[PDB]
Design an enzyme around this catalytic site. Structure first.
Site, mmCIF file in Angstrom:
data_model
loop_
_atom_site.group_PDB
_atom_site.id
_atom_site.type_symbol
_atom_site.label_atom_id
_atom_site.label_comp_id
_atom_site.label_asym_id
_atom_site.label_seq_id
_atom_site.Cartn_x
_atom_site.Cartn_y
_atom_site.Cartn_z
ATOM 1 N N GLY A 156 0.804 -1.206 0.000
ATOM 2 C CA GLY A 156 0.000 0.000 0.000
ATOM 3 C C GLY A 156 0.843 1.265 0.000
ATOM 4 O O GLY A 156 2.071 1.244 0.064
ATOM 5 N N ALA A 190 -7.962 -0.266 -3.537
ATOM 6 C CA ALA A 190 -9.031 -0.880 -2.762
ATOM 7 C C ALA A 190 -10.007 0.135 -2.179
ATOM 8 O O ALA A 190 -10.932 -0.261 -1.461
ATOM 9 C CB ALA A 190 -8.438 -1.736 -1.640
ATOM 10 N N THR A 224 -5.641 -1.421 0.812
ATOM 11 C CA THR A 224 -4.570 -2.350 0.467
ATOM 12 C C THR A 224 -3.712 -2.663 1.685
ATOM 13 O O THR A 224 -3.441 -3.834 1.982
ATOM 14 C CB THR A 224 -3.715 -1.766 -0.661
ATOM 15 O OG1 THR A 224 -4.546 -1.474 -1.794
ATOM 16 C CG2 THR A 224 -2.630 -2.749 -1.076
ATOM 17 N N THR A 282 -7.968 11.328 5.546
ATOM 18 C CA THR A 282 -9.302 11.718 5.112
ATOM 19 C C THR A 282 -10.235 10.517 4.997
ATOM 20 O O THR A 282 -11.222 10.570 4.256
ATOM 21 C CB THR A 282 -9.232 12.473 3.781
ATOM 22 O OG1 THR A 282 -8.526 11.685 2.815
ATOM 23 C CG2 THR A 282 -8.514 13.807 3.959
ATOM 24 N N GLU A 338 -11.348 3.840 8.563
ATOM 25 C CA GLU A 338 -10.121 3.186 8.999
ATOM 26 C C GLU A 338 -10.272 2.405 10.301
ATOM 27 O O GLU A 338 -9.590 1.375 10.440
ATOM 28 C CB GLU A 338 -9.000 4.222 9.127
ATOM 29 C CG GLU A 338 -8.501 4.735 7.799
ATOM 30 C CD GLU A 338 -7.426 5.780 7.961
ATOM 31 O OE1 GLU A 338 -7.771 6.953 8.208
ATOM 32 O OE2 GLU A 338 -6.235 5.429 7.857
ATOM 33 N N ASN A 355 7.722 10.216 7.255
ATOM 34 C CA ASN A 355 8.378 8.964 6.896
ATOM 35 C C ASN A 355 9.872 9.006 7.198
ATOM 36 O O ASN A 355 10.451 7.995 7.611
ATOM 37 C CB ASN A 355 8.116 8.649 5.426
ATOM 38 C CG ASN A 355 6.653 8.381 5.155
ATOM 39 O OD1 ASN A 355 5.893 8.079 6.074
ATOM 40 N ND2 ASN A 355 6.248 8.483 3.895
ATOM 41 N N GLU A 394 15.032 -13.308 17.585
ATOM 42 C CA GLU A 394 15.378 -12.712 18.870
ATOM 43 C C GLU A 394 14.416 -11.603 19.276
ATOM 44 O O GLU A 394 14.318 -11.294 20.469
ATOM 45 C CB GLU A 394 16.815 -12.187 18.827
ATOM 46 C CG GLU A 394 17.463 -12.041 20.194
ATOM 47 C CD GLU A 394 18.976 -11.947 20.118
ATOM 48 O OE1 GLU A 394 19.549 -12.411 19.107
ATOM 49 O OE2 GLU A 394 19.588 -11.407 21.066
#
Ligand code: GTP
Ligand code: ACP
Ligand code: GDP
Ligand code: O3G
Ligand code: O3G
Ligand code: CA
Ligand code: CA
Ligand code: CA
Ligand code: MG
Ligand code: MG
Ligand code: MG
Lengths: 54, 352, 438, 425
Positions: free
Chosen positions: C10, C99, C145, C179, C183, C228, C254
């Site tokens: 996505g 999607a 997605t 927006t 979700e 990001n 681990e």
């Protein structure tokens, strides 16, 4: 306050400090999910086309 | 224009704060489930702190400190005092208490017996009192067998603390009493003591030779107005305010309320709230908290003040609701949401 | 040396993946054309960085990564971007239309038609690995997605690679940078079907990243590039042990061993410090004590929550830069004497510490300033359940009216999957309360 | 490449559609002959959404012009940008529809519909990845109302999984051509409730009141009314035509705006609306206040008479994106009694750097409010006043229709009202 497992190399080191001791679905089943949902979509669309044909 | 929601309809305190907030023409009340609030007057139990401070652009404030139960639970307060170096088990102003779990369920059963066996052998007064937060159920006795057998018959955590056998008695009457002080901690963690306290007095003459009749030993308003026969004889509603209690101390003991008692009260309040500050402070949090506390104290015949308990959802004396609730709006609510003295509080300055 | 394959699903996964691999290249001295001069073994080698980079005969270091999106516009950036030459075409997979923020569309409708293709592209990377450890899967919770195809991909990965670990880097939905109203649905649906397939998942709340960018970086209105780049620093701190010489968290196994005591409770809280603005005239460099103490300030956490009112099950300190064990233990001593750090009785009260001497790298011209030392704490706290409660509450408000449900049923999903998924989240919340509360 | 096929039907549908292409063609730098003459690459970023690229860098609108009489389309072909339209895309008849829904839907329109579909089919086949369709039309006439809804039903048969979007002009006795408009509008609403995914309700009375009371136009004309529809269509489609975040495709819009399939009728709005004190700069607070004010809404429904299910707001121009978020949260956090509280975060905001022609900045408002039920109440009341006496029905029974078909359309529209009323509570 204890230190254990001190590991040292050229790019850093790591260790551990203790302060106190304590006191699936198969490939087949997935194919069914996807095809079951696809079939429900085809049923819904066929009812719409039936509605439109009427 | 600010918005607030009401999630505890039984709070006589914040019913007035809510009444005042609306009367300002600058606050609006929303449905209890609407999340776009500036101020939450939340429920007493299971207040959803985890959902506060996540509304974009809304400064959100709640009238409870998450984690304050550590101070307002009988067993929690005992564990907090014995385990906190700030308070320590040598804390001189808190009665010798022990956490005792019923036998049908850590626990401090044997430790209590050791101290108990110590007093019995030393000819000293060995009268204790067992109680629990799940009560309206209190039992006073000088025999350890009756204290523990009473907790096993129940099913919740209990605490046994030394009963103050030598309490201060008002005259005329020869009667017990307790002192209730209201304390407001704001979002900045300033500790404000309301200048007006009240004594909840017993209208019955104290009797140390009969703990069975619990009307002269327990000073609660419901017990005095239900099982006592002299209700409202000396003071109206078994409630005496500071102005009278101070004058009495000057005529009887030649001392003032400030010197003999208030200094120790201000010390106990500071000690308790500064102890848990690192755990409950909302200074660096995504929402802000304030809370009104009701401290209950006992005074012995030596003019030593003892801490009884701390109430997290306290009510107020009928004659003081107006003054105190306006004080809450001024320093706790309007301080964060300003509108368009001679404070009624005493700031207990401390090192944050 | 054991390989790790990264999968970005996505828009969020792809763009975050874009930021991470940019940073990986700068950290390992890899150029956009794929060359790495410091690598003296040409066309191969089993060095630490080879867990994330394969090598061609021409000396190109190729990421062991798969980018997957049902819409082409986001991956087209990578194909013509600065790092176009790093990846070959088989690594970038794109569909025709997305999607539409519909879990059911990404999982059932579109996923069914592209899942076998993605596996075959992943199978190709796996054929280049002599000892594949597992997968790192980046995605959002809220995208159709990111939520829908990811859950389908995770189930298939457990079928084809049963003995391989799978870690998640999941973006938790924040209304300030989204927006999309549905979700909450997509987050709970994807957590329900992915839960038993993920060994360890690092949730990043966009609300937390957003406020860190405004507060510390003085960005008034942060963009996805700002978010990001900061997220990749944290991701880089978490994957550094797999790419560099070391002895802590040396393989994906681990992460579960150190951070996950129970399979379902596999969501560690991440905290990072320090975040300093590059526009600052000049900053006073922070010490080991100050950055360690900062790991217990909610304002530096990847998810806003109050660990003071939860219990700890594990705690990892990952330092980068000028840090020696002496100063670490000194700071820890000072923190146990001031912080509310309550461990569960069945766990040791301790800290696993890792130190990498190379200080954090920063993209030139980026927002983050060069710091002499930094740390990322990974702690498994019951307080992270606050984020499940928030999400589950929003879910309940809409589902009580069945708002938007017809979109999901319209893609072939049965309504019962809503309540099945919601009931599983209710179980998750109960598990956290059993562990944290008394 | 998420192409949209535009259809405009009937007199109103073609005149409003003509002005739409005139406005957006200007925004994208396309001249009346299809040649590009702009100066910013943003004008071509998403240009293929509404325009086909012909030979010689020519841009031809992906538009189909439909009418049952030639009159109005001759005007378009002789209008400002008439040359820009693909000549093969003019499909018209000669008999007209006489403001008669039955003629547009069953008799006259049926004869012409197949050749319209042949053009729709041609435009779709030339799309890399067709998003769906938008239709401009009125509901009170015969062609746009009757044949328009017939087209939608036949387009659904062939592209069932594509988006169907309409700009629908609702009749009002204040801006009326014939007494049968409530009949035609009620029959069309029945179709729209079932066969569209998003319908922007444009009430001619709200357009009139705006021109009269706000714009201070003494004698408003259809031309003046259509200027407001042009600006509104340009605003709502800004998310699609210029580089905007959140991707912004019609399918994501529908998913996040429509919580219940039947409740897909939107109230549009636009700011500024100034009378010729037109050069003054409009601050972000002013934009926000006006955009949410009922007087700036095209549906003639007082939002304070209902509640917002979802709200989308598009700001255009170079402004403080921080100041936008502040004012949007301010309007919400100051009237949270008009937003349903069971849909978290149901107010979303989008910014676009390219403002409309001649405006430093502007705001377009898209609301899914239960207050739209008052528009259907109006139509229902007018419908029943005539239908109880069966007045003017012979125009329809003469084309093969039966009264039962009217009773069903009426019942479905009243059900729609009840459905809005339940979610308003
Ligand atoms: N931190 C961060 N979050 C992002 C980024 N891109 C999208 N998101 C978040 O992801 C959520 C939306 O999901 P997307 O990833 O954009 O959707 P998708 O996975 O591409 O699925 P589709 O619906 O098919 O487009 C929102 O909550 C966004 O805030 C990004 O680059 N960085
Ligand atoms: N250790 C002790 N020594 C002497 N008296 C005690 C005591 N503990 C409690 N009391 C008596 O009990 C009363 C307080 O009871 P307590 O406050 O524990 O019950 P409660 O919490 O249900 C009433 P409140 O509304 O004040 O919280 C006081 O009037 C006091 O006289
Ligand atoms: N806003 C606007 N409304 C119009 C216009 N022309 C007609 N109308 C309205 O549309 C209805 C008449 O429909 P019309 O389009 O003329 O019928 P058709 O040609 O058979 O589709 C009436 O309600 C008119 O008020 C126009 O140019 N602008
Ligand atoms: F703004 C408008 C208000 C009313 C109308 C309808 N009347 C149009 C007309 C008037 C007189 C002669 C011929 C036609 C149209 C637009
Ligand atoms: F995002 C979408 C939401 C809903 C839809 C349903 N399309 C119905 C339709 C198609 C063609 C003509 C008329 C109606 C399709 C996409
Ligand atoms: Ca090598
Ligand atoms: Ca597994
Ligand atoms: Ca004919
Ligand atoms: Mg009590
Ligand atoms: Mg996407
Ligand atoms: Mg006409």
């Amino acid at each position: 306050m204890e230190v254990i497992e001190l590991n040292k190399c050229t790019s850093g080191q790591s260790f551990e400090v203790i302060l106190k001791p304590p006191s699936d679905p198969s490939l087949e089943e997935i194919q069914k999910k996807l095809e079951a949902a696809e079939e429900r979509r085809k049923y819904q669309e066929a009812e719409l086309l039936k509605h439109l044909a009427e | 224009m600010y918005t607030f929601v009401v999630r505890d309809e039984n709070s006589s305190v914040y019913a007035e704060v809510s009444r005042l907030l609306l009367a300002t023409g600058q606050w609006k009340r929303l449905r209890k489930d609407n999340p776009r609030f500036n101020l939450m007057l939340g429920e007493r139990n299971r207040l959803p702190f985890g959902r506060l401070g996540h509304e974009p652009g809304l400064v959100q404030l709640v009238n409870y400190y998450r984690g304050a139960d550590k101070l307002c639970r009988k067993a929690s307060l005992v564990k907090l005092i014995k385990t906190s170096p700030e308070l320590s088990e040598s804390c001189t102003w808190f009665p010798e208490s022990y956490v005792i779990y019923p036998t049908n369920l850590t626990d401090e059963r044997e430790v209590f017996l050791a101290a108990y066996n110590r007093r019995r052998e030393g000819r000293e007064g060995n009268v204790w009192i067992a109680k629990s937060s799940a009560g309206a159920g209190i039992l006073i006795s000088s025999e350890a067998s009756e204290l523990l057998d009473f907790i096993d018959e129940q099913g919740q955590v209990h605490v046994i603390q030394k009963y103050l056998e030598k309490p201060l008695l008002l005259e005329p009457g020869h009667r017990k009493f307790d002192i209730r002080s209201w304390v407001l901690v704001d979002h900045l963690y300033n500790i404000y003591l309301y200048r007006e306290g009240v004594l909840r007095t017993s209208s019955e003459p104290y009797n140390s030779a009969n703990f069975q009749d619990k009307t002269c030993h327990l000073t609660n308003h419901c017990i005095q107005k239900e099982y006592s026969k002299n209700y409202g004889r000396y003071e109206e509603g078994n409630e005496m305010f500071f102005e009278e209690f101070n004058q009495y101390l000057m005529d009887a003991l030649n001392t003032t309320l400030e010197n003999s008692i208030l200094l120790q009260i201000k010390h106990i309040i500071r000690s308790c709230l500064m102890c848990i500050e690192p755990a409950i402070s909302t200074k660096h949090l995504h929402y802000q908290s304030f809370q009104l506390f009701g401290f209950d104290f006992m005074v012995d015949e030596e003019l030593k003040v003892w801490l009884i308990e701390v109430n997290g959802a306290p009510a107020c004396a009928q004659k003081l609701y107006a003054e105190l609730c306006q004080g809450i709006v001024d320093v706790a609510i309007s301080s964060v949401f300003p509108l368009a003295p001679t404070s009624i509080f005493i700031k207990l300055h401390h090192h944050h | 040396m054991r390989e790790c394959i990264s999968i970005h699903v996505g828009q969020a996964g792809v763009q975050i993946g874009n930021a991470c691999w940019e940073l990986y290249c700068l950290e390992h001295g890899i150029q956009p054309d794929g060359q790495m001069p410091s690598d003296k073994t040409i066309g191969g080698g089993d060095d630490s960085f080879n867990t994330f980079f394969s090598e061609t005969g021409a000396g190109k270091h190729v990421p062991r990564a798969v980018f997957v999106d049902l819409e082409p516009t986001v991956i087209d950036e990578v194909r013509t971007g600065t790092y176009r030459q790093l990846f070959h075409p088989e690594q970038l997979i794109t569909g025709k239309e997305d999607a539409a923020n519909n879990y059911a569309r990404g999982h059932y409708t579109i996923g069914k038609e592209i899942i076998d293709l993605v596996l075959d592209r992943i199978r190709k990377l796996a054929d280049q690995c002599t000892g594949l450890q597992g997968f790192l899967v980046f995605h959002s919770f809220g995208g159709g997605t990111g939520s829908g195809f990811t859950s389908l991909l995770m189930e298939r990965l457990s079928v084809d690679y049963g003995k391989k670990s799978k870690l998640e880097f999941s973006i938790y939905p924040a209304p300030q940078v989204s927006t999309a109203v549905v979700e909450p649905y997509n987050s709970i649906l994807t957590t329900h079907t992915t839960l038993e397939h993920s060994d360890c998942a690092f949730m990043v709340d966009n609300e937390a990243i957003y406020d860190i960018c405004r507060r510390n970086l003085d960005i008034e209105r942060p963009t996805y590039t700002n978010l990001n780049r900061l997220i990749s620093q944290i991701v880089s701190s978490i994957t550094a042990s797999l790419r560099f010489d070391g002895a802590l968290n040396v393989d994906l196994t681990e992460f579960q061993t150190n951070l996950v005591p129970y399979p379902r409770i596999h969501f560690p809280l991440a905290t990072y410090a320090p975040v300093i603005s590059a526009e600052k005239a000049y900053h006073e460099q922070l010490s080991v004590a100050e950055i360690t103490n900062a790991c217990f300030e909610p304002a530096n956490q990847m998810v806003k929550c109050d660990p003071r009112h939860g219990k700890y099950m594990a705690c990892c300190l990952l330092y980068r830069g000028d840090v020696v064990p002496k100063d670490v233990n000194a700071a820890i001593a000072t923190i146990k004497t001031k912080r509310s750090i309550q461990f569960v009785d069945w766990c040791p009260t301790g800290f696993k510490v890792g130190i990498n001497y190379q200080p954090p790298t920063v993209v030139p011209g980026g927002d983050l300033a060069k710091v002499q030392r930094a740390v990322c704490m990974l702690s498994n706290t019951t307080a992270i359940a606050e984020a499940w409660a928030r999400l589950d509450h929003k879910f309940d408000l809409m589902y009580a009216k069945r708002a938007f449900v017809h979109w999901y049923v319209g893609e072939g999903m049965e309504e019962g999957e809503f309540s099945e998924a919601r009931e599983d989240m209710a179980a998750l919340e109960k598990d956290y309360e059993e562990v944290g509360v008394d | 490449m998420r192409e949209i096929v535009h259809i405009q039907a009937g007199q109103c549908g073609n005149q409003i559609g003509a002005k739409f292409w005139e406005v957006i063609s200007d925004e994208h730098g396309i001249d009346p002959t299809g040649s590009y003459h702009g100066d910013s690459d943003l004008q071509l970023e998403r240009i293929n959404v509404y325009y086909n690229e012909a030979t010689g860098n020519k841009y031809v609108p992906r538009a189909i012009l439909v009418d049952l009489e030639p009159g109005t389309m001759d005007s378009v072909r002789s209008g400002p940008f008439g040359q820009i339209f693909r000549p093969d895309n003019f499909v018209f008849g000669q008999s007209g529809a006489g403001n008669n829904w039955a003629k547009g839907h069953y008799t006259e329109g049926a004869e012409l519909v197949d050749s319209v579909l042949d053009v729709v089919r041609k435009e779709s086949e030339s799309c890399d990845c067709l998003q769906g369709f938008q239709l401009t039309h009125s509901l009170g006439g015969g062609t746009g109302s009757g044949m328009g809804t017939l087209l939608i039903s036949k387009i659904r048969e062939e592209y069932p999984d594509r988006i169907m979007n309409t700009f629908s002009v609702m009749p009002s006795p204040k801006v009326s051509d014939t007494v049968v408009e409530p009949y035609n509008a009620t029959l069309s609403v029945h179709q729209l409730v079932e066969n569209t995914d998003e319908t922007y309700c444009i009430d001619n009375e709200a357009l009139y009141d705006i021109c009269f009371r706000t714009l201070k136009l003494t004698t408003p004309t259809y031309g003046d009314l259509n200027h407001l529809v042009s600006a509104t269509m340009s605003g709502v489609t800004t998310c699609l035509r210029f580089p905007g975040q959140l991707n912004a495709d019609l399918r994501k819009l529908a998913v996040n705006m429509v919580p219940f399939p039947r409740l897909h009728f939107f109230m549009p709005g636009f700011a500024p609306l100034t009378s010729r004190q037109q050069y003054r700069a409009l601050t972000v607070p002013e934009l926000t206040q006006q955009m949410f004010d009922s007087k700036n809404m095209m549906a003639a429904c007082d939002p304070r008479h209902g509640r917002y299910l979802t709200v989308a707001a598009i700001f255009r121009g170079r402004m403080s994106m921080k100041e936008v978020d502040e004012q949007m949260l301010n309007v919400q956090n100051k009237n949270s009694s008009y937003f349903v509280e069971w849909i978290p975060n149901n107010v979303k905001t989008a910014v676009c750097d390219i403002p409309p022609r001649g405006l430093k900045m502007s705001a377009t408002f898209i609301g899914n409010s239960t207050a739209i039920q008052e528009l259907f109440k109006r139509i229902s009341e007018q419908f029943t006043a005539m239908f109880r006496r069966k007045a003017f029905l012979h125009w329809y029974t003469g084309e093969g229709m039966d009264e039962m078909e009217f009773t069903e359309a009426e019942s479905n529209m009243n059900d729609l009202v009840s459905e809005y009323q339940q979610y308003q509570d």
